[PDB]
Structures are given as C-alpha cells and as structure tokens.
From a paper:
Cellular and structural studies have shown that dynein primarily exists in a pseudo-twofold symmetric, autoinhibited Phi state incompatible with movement along microtubules. LIS1 plays essential roles in the activation of dynein, including relieving autoinhibition and helping assemble the fully active DDA transport complexes.
We identified three major species: individual dynein motors (Open), Phi, and a third state similar to Phi but with two LIS1 β-propellers bound to dynein, which we termed Pre-Chi. Its 2D classes showed Phi-like features and had only one set of LIS1 β-propellers bound instead of the two seen in Chi. We obtained a 3.1 Å structure of the Pre-Chi motor domains. The nucleotide state of Pre-Chi is the same as that of Phi. This interaction is mediated by a loop on LIS1 (residues 298–308) that has not been modeled in any structure of human dynein-LIS1 to date.
Residue numbers in the entry:
A (entry chain A): 2904 to 3194
B (entry chain A): 3485 to 3846, 3849 to 3895, 3897 to 3974, 3978 to 4350
C (entry chain E): 91 to 410
D (entry chain A): 1935 to 1987, 1996 to 2031
E (entry chain B): 3630 to 3678
F (entry chain C): 91 to 263, 268 to 297, 308 to 410
The structure:
C-alpha cells in the first residue's frame, strides 16, 4: 500500500493494538485525538490492511460541496452494505466544511441509517442493489422496509469510521455540543504529542544506523537530563539522543514563549522531529565521507 | 606551501571530535529555525550550543552556519541567481537546497520567488497558483514529467497535494506510484515542489504546518543598512559605485579561479600515477599554476583599493544607513498600537528614493548634501507616514523620530532619564511617605518622590518649598512656555528633557504641548506645521503614488472622502468610475471598470469596500499581479474597520480622514473646500457671510469634539450641513439682492438665515431641547454682527487680558490671511466652554502616548 | 463599396507551409496576415506584397486555431499538444504557455474586451482564460462530444460553440449557461460565425419576419454543417430562419460579408461559395484549391479574401 | 430581503409613475444592500437635478424616464434593536 | 510496460480484442487504448504472450 | 529585394557534423536546407531556426553533389560509390538506386521537367536516367578527363557540363565547345531570365563558370565567345551562381572569401571571411534573404542578407 518506512516503539505497538481491537468490535468507530503528523491515519491504514478493511478517504479539494459529500457518503454506504465490504472510513477534521457534513456524520455514526441520502432514482437503485445482494446471500426479502433494515444491519456490521483531529479545549467543547455521536458512538484514543520516551526511542533507532561511538568521552558531573530512566552513566549515543530530545523540547518552549509574547506561532510536530533526525543522519554521513 | 598543507592535514582528530556536535547543531538549525526571525534563530542556536557545552559534547564554537553548510562556489552561484547578500538569505537558501520536506516560502518582496525562478532555470518551471482552476493538470504534468513546480498563494491551499507532500508512495514493481484523487500517476524521481506566500501575517492549519517546512524571508537590520548604503552610493557617487561593483565581480571571479586552481593541483598530484619527475608535463603544469599563484600574490593592490573604498564609504555615509534602518523599523513596529496602518519595505524604499533624487534645493557639496538628505529624510518620512495615521499618534511618531535623531547625533545618550520618563512612573514608592501638601497635592507629591530617584533631581521637595513664589509652574497659565527651576553646563536638549520630566511630574495635562515643544527644539519649529493645512491630494496623487498601489482612503465614521475624490477628478478633468461595493453586480462592474481603466488610463473609485473583505483579498492579489497604465489611480474608500485585510493595507497607501484639529485648521479646510469663484461673487457681503458660516461650523464641530459638555450626544455636523448652509445663504442672498454690488446690513435676511439653520439645516440632527437652545443662542450671537459693526467680537479667548476680534476685511484673500495669522494656541474657552474642559482629555492623551511608546520600546 | 466579391484567378498562391493549413486570419490594423498549419508553425504573410515575413516556432504539435485581439497586438494560438500560447505580436515572442486541457484544443478566440480567451477541446469542455495572469477562471460543460469551435459575440456577452454532439450551443458568459441548444443538424457541426451589426436589417427583410415590433432583433449564428448545409439561427431558444442547401461536401468555414449582404463559405468540395442569402441561393462559385479547403477569412476594410487548404498553400483573392 | 435588484425595480416603478416612496424601517436593509442602493439613489437625484436645471437615468442597466414629481423618503429608528448603520455616502 | 505471459488460452477472454488489433488513437502526443467503457493509456514497451 | 548581400557575422553555425561538407542547397518550397558530406550522410537543417532536423543515411561512400526537384518533393544525390540515389521529402526514404557509372560521380541535377536525372562522373560520360524506374536512356561522350559539374538549362533541352579537359561542352537532347580555358574548369552557373536586360545594359541563354585558374569567365552559347573575364581570386574557385535578381554575381573559392561581383564594372566590393578553411559550395535563396556556404572544415554557416 504505502512505501513509507515507519518506526516501532511501545506507544506505536499499543496504539496499533487498540485500533485493531476497535476494528474487531462490530459497529466500532474511532476518535483519535493528537497533534498532526503524529501518525494516526497511517496507523489506521496499516491496521485496516491487516484486518482486510478497505481504507476510504473523502479526498476533499477546493470548491467542495455538501452534495459532493453526500455522493461520497452514498458510495461508501453502497460499498459497505450492498457489496458486503469492510470499509475503514478515515475522516480528518479538516474535511469538515460546514454543519451539513457533521450532522450527516452524526446520524450515520449513531444509527447506520441516513434518511434522505437516497431519494428517487437513487433509492430505486439502492433497493435493486440490495435485492441483488439478498439474492447473492440467499435471503429472500419481499418489499422495501425489510430490505432497508437488512441494508442498515449490513452497513452497521461493515462500516468503520475513524476520526483524526488536533487537540483543543474549545474545539472539543464545540464538537461535544454539535456532534454527540463522536462522544457516544465513537471510542476515544488520546494519542497526543509524542512523549519524551517516544522521542528518545525514535532518535536512538535512527542513530543506531550511523557509527559515532566515542570511547574517550568524559561524562560531566552535572548531566542535565530531560528524559527520565536514562542510563547513568550515558554513552555518547545516549548523550546525543538526549540532546536531540532537548532540542525538540526547547523548540516547544521557545514557541510557547513567542505565543505568550504575542507573535505568530507555528506547530512543532513529530514530523519536525523525524525531519531533524533525517537531516542529522544525512549531514553526518556526507561530512564524514567528504572529510 | 607544504608549510600550510601540513597544518591543514594535521587536524584530523580535532575534526573527528567536533564533527558530531557541529552536524547536530547544523541539522537542528536547518530543520527547526526556518520560520523564525534572526533574533529567535540566534537565540535557538545559543541555547543548543549552551546545552551541548554543559553536556560536554564537542562542537566547533568558532564556526559560521552558512560557511559550514554552503560552499564558496555554491554561494557565488546563489548570488549570481539574484539572491541578496544577507546571512539570513544565505541560511534560507541553505534550507531551500537541503530541504527534506517540501519548502514553504514566505516573502512579501518576491526576491525569494525570483531567486527560485533563477536557480531552477536550467530545469523548466511552471508557475501556477492554488486558486488557478487548471492547477491539477499542471501538478499532474509536473508529476508525470519531472519538472520543478512553484505554486504561489498557499492561503487557498488545495488538499489534493496531501499525498504528494506526505510521500504516500506505492512501489509496485519497478515503477513509482502516487495516488491523488482517483487517478494513479507514475511519479518521476526528479520532481520538486515549492509553496510560496507573500505575507508574513497569515495563519496556517497545523496539518499543513506539519507536512511543510517554512522558510521566512524577513528583513534584517544589517541587510537594510547595506541596501541603504548602496543606494546612497548610487545617488551620490555613481562612478565609485560602478568601480565597487566591477571590483566585487572581479574579486569573486578570481576567488573562483583560486578554488579551481587548488582543486586541479591536488587532483593532478593525486592522479600523476607514478613518478612526478618522469614526465615534464607535470612540472610545466605546476610552473603555470605557480605563476597564477604569483598573480594571486599580486592581488594585494586590489585588496588595497578594496580597503580604500570601504574606508571612504564608511567614513562618509556611516550614520545615514543606521538612521534609515531605525526609521524603517520604527514604522514597522508602529503597526502594534493601532493595527490600521501597515507599512512595507517598498513603502520605506519609496520614501528613501523620493528623498534621494527628487529633492528641491538639493548644491553640489558632499559636506552639506548628507545633512540635507538626513533632515529631509526625517521630514519626508514623517509626512508620508503621519498622513495616514491618527492625530493622537502624530506626536508619538514625531517623538520616536526625535529619539532616532538624538541617538544618531555630540549629545550624550540620556537613557536613564528617558527610561524614567517612560517606565519609571510605575516604580514603587516608599511605604507611608508624604511630603508637604502646603502648596502641592498628593498625586504630584508622589510624582515628585518618584522623580527624585534621578541624581539630577536630588533636592526637589526642599527646592519647591524654598521657591514658594513659583506659583506659575504650580498652576494656571501655560507652564510649558516658561518652566522655572533646574534639574555643569546644560545642553538645550537636556534642559528640554529635564523640563519635560518636571511637567510630567507636576502637570500632566501640558504633556502634549511640551512634547510638541521638544520636537520643535529637536528637529525644527515647522516640523509638524505641514499637517495643519488641508491635504495636498492633487500633488500626492500626481507624484507620490505609483499606479499599481491603490489609494486607500480610510475615514472615521461621520466623514467621507468620495466628494474629495470626485472634486479632484473634476478639477483635473479626469473621468472617473464611481462604484459602490456591496452587490454581485457591484463586484462585476468593479472588475470590468478596473480592467478597462487599467488598459486605457482612466480613474476608478470603489466606495465602502470594507463590507467585502473576502473580495478585498482577491482585489489585492489582482492588483499585485496587474501591470497598469502610466496615469491610473484606484481609490478605495473605507472606514476604520478591523476587518480590512492586512494584505490590502500593506499594498495600498493609507490616507486617514479625521476631524480637523483646531478652529484655525477647520477654517482653513472650509475655505480651501469652498471655491474662490463661488465665494467671490457679488455682492461684497457674501465674503462676510461665508466667513461667518465657516466660523460657526468650526466652533460647533470643536464643541462636538468636547463632549458631553459641548453637546449632550455626539451628533454628526459635517460637510453636507456646510454645503446645504452655503446653498441656502447663496439662494437667500440672490433673492434679497438682484445685481446690487453692495447691500446694507439691514436688508439682508439675517433672521431668515438664522431660523433656517435652527430648524432645517443644523437643527435636523438635534433632538434635545437644551441642545436646540444652545444652537439657537449661538446663531443669535453670530448672525447679527451688530449690523456689521467694526471691531466686532466673535468670542473671547481668555477671560484674563485676552480677546478675539473679528477682522474688518472685505475680500476672501484677507479673510484667509486673517485665518492663517490666527494664533497657533487654542483654548476650550474659544468655543465658549469652561477652561477646565480639556484637562482630563489632555491627561488621558498624555498617558496613552506614554503607554504606546512604552509598548513599542518594550517590544523593540 | 459593400458589394465586392472574390473573383478568379487568385492574386498570390503562397506556398511556404509544410503540412495542411488549418486556419487563416487577417490582421486588424496592419497589412499582414497569419496562417496556422499542421507542422506546428504559424507563418506570417504580407498579403499586399505577397512575401513570407517570418515564422513563429514554439508549438510541439499541429496548431489548430489562431485569433487576434481588437488592438492587433496579441495573437492567441492553440494546438494539438494540449497547450494554448499567447504571442506578443509586437516582438513576435511567446508570452505564456497555458496548459489545462485534457485533449486536442480545437479553437480559441479573444473576447472583444481583450483580456479573456475562450477555448474548445476534445474533452467536451470550454474554458475561459485570463490574458493578464494566465489562470483558468471559468469552465463550461454540457457538450457530450468533441467541441470543435468557439466564437464570442460582438460585445462579448454571449458565446457560441459547435461540437461532434450534433448541436450548436450558445450561452451567456457571465453567470448563466445554455441559453439555447440548436439541434437541426443531422451530422456534425463544424463552423459557426455570428452576424455583424450591419446585417440585421437585411436578415429581417430576407427571412419570414414581421416589421420588427419587438426591439433588439436578436443575434444570428451561421451554419456548422458536416451535412453540406448552411443554417442561421435566432434569439431565445433559437429557430432556423433559413437553410442554404446547394453545397457539395463537408462545410469547413462560414462568414458574412463586411457589408452583411452576402455569406462566404468554403468546404471540402475544393470550392469557395458566395451565398446571396436574401434569395437562399449561391450566386458565385470559386474553384479555390486542389484539395480540401479548411478555412477562410474576409478583410473588414480592404478587398481581400484569403483561404487556407490541405494543399499546404494559402491563397489570397482580390475582390472586384 | 429587499435586495439591490428589488429596490431597483421599486425605484424604476416609482420613477416611471411619478410617485413618492416612504421606506419604513430602512435601517434593517443591511449594510451591503444599503451601500448598493446608494448608487441608484444618487443616480435618481442627479437626474432630478438635471430636470430642475426626455430625461432618463441609468437604473438596473436600463434607461428609465424620471418624472419630476417623484421623491424618495426614508423612515428610521436608530438604536432600535442593534440594526444596521447607513453608509456615509 | 510489463510483459505478460497469459497461459490457458483455450478459455480465451474477449477483452483483449482491441489490444490484439492495436486499435489505438493518438490524441495529443500519446496513445490511447479502449477497454470497455474504461479508457487507459498504453505504454510503448508492452508485449503480451 | 535587390540589395541582399551577406553581412558579418554568421547568423547560425550548424556545426553538428563530423566530416567535411561538399554541397549545400536550399529547398524551393519549404524553409529547410540540406547538406551533403564526406561520411555518406545528408543532413536536413532549418535555416530559419538553426536546428538540426534529420539525417539521410544510406550511401556507402562520400556524397559529392545533391539537387532538388522543381516541386521540392524529390531529392537526388550522387556519391563516390558509383550510385545515383533518389530521395523523396514525404517519408525521407530511399526510392531507387541507379548504377552504371564506372567511377566516382561528381555531379547530379534534376531536369526542370521533373522526369529525368543528369549525372557526371570521372569516366568522362554524362548519363540520363528515368525517375520512374531508374533505367538509363542516353549517354554523352566527348570528354577525356574528370567531369566535375553538370547543370541543365531552364527548359530541359540544353545541358552544360564542365570537365578537366579544359572544355565546357554543351549538348542538345554538341551545340558548342569552348576551349579557351587555361586550367581545369570546376563549376557552372546558368544565367536566369532576370539578367538579360542587365547584361544588355552592361554589355541568351548565357553561361558563367569558375575554374582553378584563379578567375571566372562567361560565354554565350549562341556564339561561343567569352563576354567578360572576372579575375581577382587568390585561390581555386569552387562555386559560382547568379543572384536571384540577375544583377550581382555570387562566388566562392579556396581563399576563404565570398566575393560578390557584377558585370557592370567587373570588380570586387566586399570579401567575407567565411570559414577557417576552404569553402566548397554555397547557395542563394531565390526569395528569402539568406546565404549559406558549405565549407570543408565540417561546418555549415548561414549569412543574413541586408
Ligand atoms: N511511527 C512513525 N515512524 C516514522 N514516521 C512516522 C511515524 N508515524 C508517522 N510518521 C510520519 O508521518 C507521516 C504521515 O503522517 P500522518 O499519519 O498523515 O499524520 P496524521 O495522522 O496526524 O495526519 C509519514 O510520512 C511518516 O513519515
């Protein structure tokens, strides 16, 4: 599916296990809260591929319309109910443009039935597709009400919806007020920012490739440490990974200081950290080779 | 030369020790210090270096990030491809070359975009925009083919770029696949993309902030000083500048020759492959290389003329570049006290180009030309900046310019007393301390206690107790004009500062007048004097406004500049297209009219455009991407509204339309508005009537300013009322006079005019009975003149030994002469108000000026 | 006057091209003309003298249409390499290459306002472009097949199109779309042209119509027949005022006279036809070329008609 | 809901008839449409001044004869319920 | 552009008829082959056995 | 359209080559030019742009001369492998190869009627072929040495060929023989119909030919006498040709100079430093203002005419 090399640590393994257990749960919807670039949609894609679920994304663009969202919802509901396909519906909060998106998402998460989505010719097409699906499954159903009930049961069994949004107190209050199914019919998982242990593990995993061991390295008595449970005394690799972690943390502190002063602020992310360690590896290799 | 080769090659262990730390520092800088400015970049680097030092990780302290991460040939290629010589610009180019995530470029100037265009010019760049409808076709063409892509206007970001930025790539077989939308596109390896925005004040969502890396092209003080030095070299010594430019190019080419020669020598000595003495070709090549090393040795004459050029340009034009950098950074930090006016580097450079070249009375003497340039730079900067700023903040900007002039010029730095003047008012006082309240009061006693912290004011309580006869500075009159007492010879500027501190401690209501006196003593008496006259709109539009910059005309509520622009177009005989923004057909008509006016060269005016900010952003983008006629001006009429986009505010030229300050300025504005042909018509009493109208209008408008004593509620007495009044006066004078050159003061319909003003013209807005009675008694006082009695009194200025007499003139020329020679001082008793009306207002304005200056200084 | 008609033989037979000539147009202000062919070149010819002036390389595939603006200082060309180029005719260099279409672009024109360009391509879409920036601002849909030609009206408020969809579709530019859909052609629609202002009186008195009594007589289209006919239409939903049967093969280009008293037409029958449309008959027949005639143009003031053909030759006809 | 085009239709009807117009509660016409209608009001008053000295004014992209007897009146209650503010022009 | 070796041609699939007939079109500078209602670009370096 | 004289510098230097260039000509219709060579290659260039279009391989030895059909759709080339190869400008492929010459062929030209091909080789014979099937029709004899160039008339009935036998024979399908030479005559230029009035003012059909005798001389086929002798060349003359307007004379030689002559006064006005080595051939566009010279230093250069 994706040629993106991921890095493993305890938080990644635990998050993958939680996402897998909720996918195994029937009518199981996620709500992943965490900073952007922390790897929520890629973990969801990987777990859906492991479980055989087909990842479906809105693929929003400019000049998007509530009618276009209705069409995407119709396609995913048809695939999940008539064709009997397990779909992992990944939906970031950036895909929400107005309340027309989120009211329909609320109804879909809470019931599995969205009245008014299929009307007229679309309703007739859905009914004949459900009749074909009932013929394929062997169940014989007469008239439309039990066909729609069977379709609702099928989409309840099949569809899984995963949300991905950044943490915010006011945003969470707004979402809890305007969309209760995110807080009642969705399992919440506060991924958050990468912890100090996760940053240390990622830095050590990338650093282990390149050789920088210094036998004649003197450990100072002070050793300002930012990651707890650091091995004392630390080696050169441990010292520089602690230094990388401190670099990320002091970027957080400087950004907070700038925001408190009143200047514009920018998000600092695990993507920034991976970028920094990749730059470190490439620059170290190039400089050592050329010298 | 092996005596140098051995030293070069005997640092292997030291470089192995330092390489890990130095690579860590450089990688952290490249990855994290992209969005920040120079100060935060340096702060982050210092913090990282301090952490490495206290963790005992070896790194090279005496290194430069630009020199470590960039080669000399690479840097020369960069400045060949249109890049500024800034260290910050070089760092930005390093990020743009070694990016891992695709870059986002922030630059209002466009120099970064031009540099990218020149650098990736060997490859083919298409320059599209995120708001181009056919953007996906260009993106997929670049993806399939392998072309660099530069897309501007990131604010309308297209989330179809998300898999491209995230590198969500499939590697089925030997091909490389990325899936955008429904189509599957083969991804070529030689594809890069650059996102570009043209404003620093923009908010990006956190997902985009994660998936892109930022490169901020901010302006540095050193870069601005270099630019101003080069420009003054252009404007003063063109031959010297030409010599310097050819010199820099020649030196760069010869340094490239040095690098090539050293590389060739080392590669030949490494690839000799046998015995060097076996073949004479190696010896001959080394002889040629040594002859070129000899010309490298004789480079010393070029280095000598380098030093002579640097020393003469420094010793002449050192303190002008620093002054210009201070001016620009003052007007850049000015944006955070009113958030209406935003000024661009292009705006400051236009001011500097105006003062450098088109200066009247500027000679052929380099001794005096620098002083003339500096003084006119200060004055022109004040004029062009404060024409689009509030009369509250005029004095603040003037005093900041005075501080810049004082720092530039002799006079020592009065930092201690300036810090006490700005911040020292909030210092903690002694517990349970109270001086004598025999002549002073408690608040000014506490102020004197605070002021006594200065060494010069060691004895203040004893001095004011001994000087009991100095009741003039204690109360009444104008203490600023005559400030007794004192803080070694005393410079006039230091005396002004000490007296300003005394006034701030004793009587804060004279702070504005004393700040005006300080500005007058520091820069000239006639510094602020150009802001009393009506704005020279015809000259400014004709000369000081480029066609592609819209003429933003912001007005406080109650005032509108549409009549001013229409009158300007009528008097210059230029046809105009007035469109009132606020409809879909209005937007379509605005687009069509602006296109036709750009192609042809007419004038276009769009009114009330503060109601459509989303369309204002698109208009700003179109005006930036547009190339207009030579004589074309776009007028945008707005209101003081925080919904006006910062993009349009920076792109345009702001003219704040404000209530005219003072009766004299109000009369001058009224007389300039009323045409001379209209006011000079028969009979001869029309001039008297128009002067009475102008005086009445000025008095009631200034009374409106002094609320709620002047009027119970803030009415809007304006130019519509004045024009209707003039029309009624003209009609009644024509009715009562049929071709008569002179009309006796008894036959004129004074009562008819008075009751028509009382009922219809000015009394329409008035609803309160007491306000109506006040208007009626002003009309009765003014519109009888005791039958045009000589030495008639319009009002009384001061109740003690002062009065205002109406002139005995007959012609508009001598009336406006009397108005011009009216005294510059004003008192609320001119209007008929109590003398204590303005005290609280002046105190509040003074403390607000102090707060604004303190905020700008603290955030500086 | 308002009566000159091309007469045999031709004035000059300019034969500098290498592939079939696609479109030939005149210059608005100069005594020069340009011609587009299938060898990715746009030759510029002085029709008064008869000598080749210069060429405009830059297109990768066969250039299919060219159009000047009102000032005569811009030339917009579209080709089969899915790109549209804007030529600075003062210095004869390309200003911008404007991608965005998905197939062979078939025709372009510059609106009378002068800062917008229309298009038409095989992906059944018509796009509006910006001359100043090069961006696409509006796309038109509705045609079910390859759109062959697009022509804005006299004041730029209406756009007509012809397609392999068998239909002529005309719409207002600004906000609404599909003002009319004209469906009386039994084969492909190929070449449209509006009616000039000094033709409305003759059209009204020639066709079945009352003595106006409605005001604003309404615009009139022309032909577009691969079924060897000529058809002019009306305002609103559109009716065929007359059909000029009498043609021989696939009609490729139609025009009005400068005075509006005649219809000029050329086609694959190697024939230039002059139609006296007041009597619904062709009163003059010109054996133009030795192969299919692809395009023609008529000079607004000077008496010259120029025709391009698959013969790889561009012929200029003097009018007597 | 009195749009710019609706007010233009009312204006052309009033101009052709020669009748006064009393617009009650004008300050709830909202800012955008008030500013748009200002242009039509200015055009009508300019045509009336030209009459004062076959007189037409450009209303809704058409030429409409202006009878000399018409006038436009505005009834307002400022500060009623935080309604709209008229533009200065 | 991957070569194919499609065995078991006794149960031949008639979807390959345009491919075997080389019924291609050359809109633009590329080549277009039609499979059913779907339209797909054909790479030059493709053979099928 | 008469003042067209080449001016410095070279507009375009078509150096995309590897072997010496022998002959260069212009296309009568299209805006391209072709060039023969020593490495059995004929390359087509675009003289307006300067870009290399295509090469026409298929010869097995050095190409001597090349000539075009009147319509410009047919190209005939002769080489040193005793062949007269025929090319078309529709698909750019060899149509037919004609054998029958006993040694190196040095000249070829399409008849103005576009049906027969003339050739001239070292075996001192002139051969006429059929463009339809490549079958020879007639052979001409009367030379005893190397025949360098042969050039037809404007009607297809008069044929002039120059040889190393110090003669320029003229045959009618021998009208005259001119034996007042002093060295080997190398190139032949025919006088167009746009020069009869000019030469009547200064002094048909007329014949002008350079030679290795450092001079150019010109006769009348109706009388067989030299009209005017043009002298001043510093080396062997390789190529001569009339101006399109029939007023000037263009020629090239081994002195690396283009001298533009005239029969009004018989003197040189401007010599052009063309190449760093000898100049083998040149051509003048009949309507366009361009001069191209093919030189033996493996370069082809095009001169603007102002
Ligand atoms: N555990 C990980 N190890 C390495 N890289 C990761 C990891 N998690 C995320 N990433 C990076 O994040 C990118 C995708 O981020 P994404 O999942 O879109 O963030 P979000 O889920 O917050 O939108 C990938 O390109 C990948 O390089």
């Amino acid at each position: 599916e994706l040629d993106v090399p991921l890095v493993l640590f305890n938080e990644v393994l635990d998050h993958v296990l939680r996402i897998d257990r909720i996918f195994r749960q029937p009518q199981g919807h996620l709500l992943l809260i965490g900073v952007s670039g922390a790897g929520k949609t890629t973990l969801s894609r990987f777990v859906a591929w492991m479980n055989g679920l087909s990842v479906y994304q809105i693929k929003v663009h400019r000049k998007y319309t509530g009618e276009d969202f209705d069409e995407d919802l119709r396609t995913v509901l048809r695939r999940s109910g008539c064709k009997n396909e397990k779909i992992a519906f990944i939906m970031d909060e950036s895909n929400v443009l107005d309340s027309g998106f989120l009211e329909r998402m609320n109804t879909l998460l809470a019931n599995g039935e969205v009245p008014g989505l299929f009307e007229g010719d679309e309703y007739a097409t859905l009914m004949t597709q459900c009749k074909e699906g009932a013929q394929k499954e062997g169940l014989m159903l007469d008239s439309h009400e039990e066909l729609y009930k069977w379709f609702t049961s099928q989409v309840i069994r099949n569809l899984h919806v995963v949300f991905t949004m950044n943490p915010s107190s006011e945003g969470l209050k707004d979402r809890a007020a305007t969309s209760p199914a995110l807080f009642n019919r969705c399992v919440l998982n506060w991924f958050g920012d990468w912890s100090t242990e996760a940053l240390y593990q990622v830095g050590k995993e990338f650093t282990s490739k390149m050789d920088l061991e210094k036998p004649n390295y003197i450990v100072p008595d002070y050793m300002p440490v930012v990651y707890d449970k650091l091995p004392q005394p630390p080696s050169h690799r441990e010292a520089i990974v602690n230094s990388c972690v401190f670099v990320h943390q002091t970027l957080h502190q400087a950004n907070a200081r700038l925001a408190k002063r009143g200047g514009r602020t920018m998000a600092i992310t695990p993507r920034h950290y991976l970028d920094f360690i990749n730059h470190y590896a490439n620059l170290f290799h190039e400089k050592r080779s050329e010298l | 030369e092996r005596e140098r080769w051995e030293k070069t090659s005997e640092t292997f262990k030291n470089q192995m020790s330092t390489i890990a730390g130095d690579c860590l520092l450089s990688a952290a800088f490249i990855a994290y210090a992209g969005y920040f400015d120079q100060q935060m970049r340096q702060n982050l680097f210092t913090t990282w270096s301090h952490h490495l030092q206290q963790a005992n990780i070896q790194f090279r302290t005496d290194i430069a990030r630009t020199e470590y991460l960039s080669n000399a040939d690479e840097r020369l290629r960069w400045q060949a491809s249109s890049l500024p010589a800034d260290d910050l610009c070089t760092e930005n180019a390093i990020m743009l070359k070694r990016f891992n995530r695709y870059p986002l470029i922030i630059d209002p100037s466009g120099q970064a975009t031009e540099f990218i265009m020149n650098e990736y010019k060997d490859r083919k760049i298409t320059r599209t925009s995120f708001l181009d409808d056919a953007f996906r076709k260009n993106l997929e063409s670049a993806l399939r083919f392998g072309n660099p892509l530069l897309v501007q206007d990131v604010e309308s970001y297209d989330p179809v770029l998300n898999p491209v930025l995230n590198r969500e790539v499939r590697r089925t077989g030997g091909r490389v696949l990325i899936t955008l939308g429904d189509q599957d596109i083969d991804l070529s390896p030689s594809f890069v993309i650059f996102l570009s925005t043209r404003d620093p004040t923009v908010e990006f969502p956190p997902d985009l902030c994660s998936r892109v890396t930022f490169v901020n092209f901010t302006v540095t003080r050193s870069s601005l000083q270099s630019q101003c030095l080069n420009e003054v070299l252009k404007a003063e010594r063109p031959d010297v500048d030409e010599k310097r430019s050819d010199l820099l190019k020649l030196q760069g080419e010869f340094q490239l020759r040095l690098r090539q020669l050293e590389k060739s020598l080392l590669q030949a000595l490494n690839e000799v492959k046998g015995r060097i003495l076996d073949d004479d070709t190696i010896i001959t090549t080394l002889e040629n290389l040594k002859r070129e090393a000899a010309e490298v040795t004789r480079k010393v004459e070029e280095t000598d003329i380098v030093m002579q050029e640097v020393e003469t340009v420094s010793q002449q034009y050192l303190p002008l570049s620093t002054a210009c950098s201070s001016i620009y950074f003052t007007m850049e930090s000015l944006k955070q006290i009113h958030f209406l006016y935003q000024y661009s580097l292009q705006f400051f450079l236009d001011i500097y180009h105006n003062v450098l070249y088109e200066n009247p009375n500027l000679v052929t003497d380099h001794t005096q030309r620098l002083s003339i340039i500096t003084k006119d730079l200060f004055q022109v900067a004040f004029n062009r900046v404060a024409r689009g700023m509030l009369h509250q903040d005029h004095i603040t900007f003037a005093m900041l310019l005075a501080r810049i002039k004082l720092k530039g010029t002799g006079e020592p730095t009065y930092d201690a007393e300036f810090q006490h003047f700005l911040r020292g008012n909030e210092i903690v006082l002694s517990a349970g301390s109270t001086p004598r309240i025999q002549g002073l009061t408690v608040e000014q006693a506490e102020a004197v206690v605070r002021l006594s912290c200065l060494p010069a004011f060691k004895d203040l309580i004893a001095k004011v107790q001994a000087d009991e006869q100095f009741g003039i500075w204690l109360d009444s009159s104008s203490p600023e004009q005559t400030v007794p007492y004192l803080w070694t010879p005393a410079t006039p500027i230091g005396q002004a500062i000490h007296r300003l501190l005394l006034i701030q401690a004793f009587r804060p209501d004279r702070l504005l007048a004393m700040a005006h006196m300080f500005v007058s003593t520091n820069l000239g008496e006639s510094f602020m004097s150009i802001m009393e006259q009506p704005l020279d709109l015809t000259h400014i539009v004709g000369t000081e406004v480029k066609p592609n910059t819209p003429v933003l005309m912001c007005s406080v509520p109650g005032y509108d500049a549409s009549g001013h622009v229409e009158d300007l177009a009528a008097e210059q005989n230029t046809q105009i297209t007035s469109i009132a923004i606020g409809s879909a057909e209005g937007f379509n008509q605005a687009d069509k009219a602006i296109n036709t006016a750009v192609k042809s060269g007419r004038w276009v005016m769009l009114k009330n455009v503060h109601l459509a900010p989303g369309w204002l952003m698109q208009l700003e983008k179109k005006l930036h991407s547009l190339q207009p006629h030579a004589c074309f001006r776009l007028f945008l009429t707005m209101e003081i509204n925080p919904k006006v986009p910062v993009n349009l505010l920076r792109a345009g030229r702001i003219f704040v339309f404000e209530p005219p300050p003072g009766v004299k300025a109000n009369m001058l504005r009224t007389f300039s508005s009323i045409p001379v042909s209209r006011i000079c018509k028969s009979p001869n009493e029309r001039a008297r009537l128009y002067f009475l109208l102008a005086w009445f209008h000025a008095i009631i408008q200034e009374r409106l300013r002094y609320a709620p004593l002047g009027w119970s509620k803030k009415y809007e007495f304006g130019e519509s009322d004045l024009r209707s009044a003039c029309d009624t006066v003209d009609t009644w004078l024509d009715d009562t006079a049929k071709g008569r050159q002179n009309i006796s003061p008894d036959k004129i319909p004074w009562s008819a005019l008075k009751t028509l003003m009382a009922q219809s013209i000015y009394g329409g807005r008035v609803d309160n009975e007491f306000d109506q009675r006040l208007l009626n008694t002003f009309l009765e006082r003014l519109f009888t003149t005791r039958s045009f009695d000589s030495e008639f009194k319009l009002a009384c200025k001061v109740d003690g030994h002062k009065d205002i007499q109406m002139p005995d003139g007959i012609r508009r020329e001598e009336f406006v002469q009397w108005v011009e020679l009216l005294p510059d001082t004003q008192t609320p008793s001119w209007l008929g108000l109590p003398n204590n009306a303005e005290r609280v207002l002046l105190t509040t304005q003074g403390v607000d000026m102090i707060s604004k200056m303190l905020k700008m200084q603290m955030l500086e | 006057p308002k009566e000159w008609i091309p007469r045999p033989p031709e004035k000059y037979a300019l034969s500098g091209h290498r592939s079939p000539v696609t479109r030939v147009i005149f210059h608005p202000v100069f005594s020069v003309m340009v011609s587009a062919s299938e060898d990715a070149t746009i030759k510029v010819w002085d029709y008064e003298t008869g000598d080749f002036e210069r060429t405009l390389k830059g297109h990768t595939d066969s250039v299919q249409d060219i159009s000047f603006d009102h000032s005569g200082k811009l030339l917009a060309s579209c080709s089969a390499d899915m790109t549209i180029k804007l030529w600075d005719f003062q210095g004869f260099e390309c200003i911008r290459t404007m991608h965005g279409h998905d197939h062979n672009v078939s025709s372009v024109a510059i609106m009378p306002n002068g800062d917008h360009i229309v298009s038409a391509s095989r992906d059944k879409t018509i796009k509006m472009w910006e001359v100043q920036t090069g961006y696409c601002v509006k796309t038109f849909t509705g045609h079910r097949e390859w759109v062959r030609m697009v022509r804005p009206n006299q004041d730029g408020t209406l756009i007509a199109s012809c397609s392999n969809d068998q239909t002529v579709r005309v719409w207002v530019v600004a906000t609404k779309e599909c003002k009319a859909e004209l469906r009386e052609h039994e084969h492909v629609v190929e070449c449209i042209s509006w009616a000039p202002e000094s033709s409305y009186s003759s059209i009204s008195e020639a066709t079945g119509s009352e003595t106006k009594k409605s005001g604003k007589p309404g615009p009139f289209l022309l032909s577009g027949s691969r079924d060897k006919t000529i058809k002019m239409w009306d305002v609103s939903t559109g009716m065929c005022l007359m059909t000029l049967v009498g043609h021989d093969n696939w009609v490729r280009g139609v025009l009005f006279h400068s005075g509006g008293k005649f219809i000029l037409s050329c086609a694959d029958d190697k024939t230039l036809r002059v139609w006296d449309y007041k009597n619904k008959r062709c009163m003059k027949t010109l054996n133009a070329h030795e192969h299919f005639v692809t395009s023609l143009d008529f000079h607004k003031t000077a008496p010259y008609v120029v025709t391009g053909s698959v013969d790889q030759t561009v012929k200029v006809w003097e009018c007597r | 809901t009195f749009d710019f085009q609706a007010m233009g239709r009312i204006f052309v009807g009033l101009c052709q008839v020669g009748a006064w117009g009393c617009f009650d509660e004008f300050n709830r016409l909202e800012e955008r449409m008030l500013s748009a209608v200002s242009q039509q009001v200015q055009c009508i008053q300019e045509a009336l001044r030209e009459h004062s000295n076959p007189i037409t004014c450009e209303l809704l992209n058409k030429q409409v004869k202006v009878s000399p007897d018409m006038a436009i009146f505005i009834t307002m209650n400022p500060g009623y319920a935080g309604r709209s503010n008229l533009p200065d022009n």
